[PDB]
Design an enzyme around this catalytic site. Structure first.
Site: not given
Length: 124
Positions: A12, A41, A119-121
């Site tokens: 990210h 992905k 984590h990227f939400d």
């Protein structure tokens, strides 16, 4: 093994550029960060900010994650981001992406000591 924190950075973070500079940004970055090794992905977001500024989000506005967990945090400020989404012509191992520039608040999930993004939400 790679830690969750290190995986967040690899997936990210892109502090080396201020914004995506061409239509090929996602194609190049998804490949170089090893995000297409086993499969394409489907979506990803890159954040064009310092690592310290993104880590600081873990001390900002606590909000529910999309799945209902409560260890998510929303940034008080908008950040420069790039959205990458698979195109219709993508076919493993030749994964292909559309690059979209945006300036949005980010929502991350944090864990650990030190308490850092894992984590990227979402972006909002």
């Amino acid at each position: 093994k790679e830690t969750a924190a290190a995986k967040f950075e690899r997936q990210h973070m892109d502090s080396s550029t201020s914004a995506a500079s061409s239509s090929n940004y996602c194609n190049q970055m998804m490949k170089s960060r090893n995000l297409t090794k086993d499969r394409c992905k489907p979506v990803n977001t890159f954040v064009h900010e310092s690592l310290a500024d993104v880590q600081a989000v873990c001390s900002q506005k606590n909000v529910a994650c999309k799945n209902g967990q409560t260890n998510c945090y929303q940034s008080y400020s908008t950040m420069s981001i790039t959205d990458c989404r698979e195109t219709g012509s993508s076919k493993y191992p030749n994964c292909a992406y559309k690059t979209t520039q945006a300036n949005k608040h980010i929502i991350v999930a944090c864990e650990g000591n030190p308490y850092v993004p894992v984590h990227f939400d979402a972006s909002v």
